[PDB]
């Protein structure tokens, strides 16, 4: 999963944006006796631990603590128009303030694919850290990324 010195991406729940991030340390908090400060479950499973990741773009932050749910391995496979499938989750750049400009790596699923005599249009659903934008059109189709998972 996420080991020290591993290359994984971290997402900011407040903005729902994904950016390159590196793993610096992995740790977990346990209860003093029988009154845990506030954890979903006692430490024991790899998912029951806390991971420390830093943002390469903004390393000044220092050390950030994030759960595995918000941390995912960096994509390693690029999907081309010919390799685009429906129902697959991919990462693309979406800018809610100015969709016609550059956006941050926002997760989204392929909704529908459309081709024209000399133009291509792709439809995908975009989800923000809290707001939803399903049924949205993707201006950039060449920028498509696949998400990798541990498989369990």
């Amino acid at each position: 999963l996420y080991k020290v010195n591993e290359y994984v991406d971290a997402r900011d729940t407040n903005m729902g944006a994904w950016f390159e991030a590196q793993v610096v340390r992995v740790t977990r908090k346990a209860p003093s006796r029988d009154e845990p400060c506030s954890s979903t479950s006692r430490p024991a499973l790899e998912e029951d631990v806390i991971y420390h990741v830093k943002y390469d773009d903004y390393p000044e932050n220092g050390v950030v603590q994030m759960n595995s749910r918000d941390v995912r391995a960096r994509a390693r496979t690029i999907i081309k128009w010919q390799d685009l499938e429906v129902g697959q989750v991919v990462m693309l750049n979406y800018n809610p303030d100015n969709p016609k400009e550059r956006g941050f790596w926002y997760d989204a699923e392929i909704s529908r694919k459309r081709e024209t005599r000399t133009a291509r249009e792709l439809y995908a659903n975009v989800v923000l850290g809290d707001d939803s934008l399903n049924d949205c059109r993707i201006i950039f189709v060449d920028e498509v990324f696949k998400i990798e998972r541990p498989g369990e």
Binding site: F19, E20, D56, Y94, N95, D97, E101, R102, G103, W105
Partner: peptide
């Protein structure tokens, strides 16, 4: 890894 690290292209927001 190497002399420097490579980053992926990504930009958004409304810079001033």
């Amino acid at each position: 890894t190497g002399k420097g690290k490579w980053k992926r292209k990504s930009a958004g927001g409304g810079p001033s």
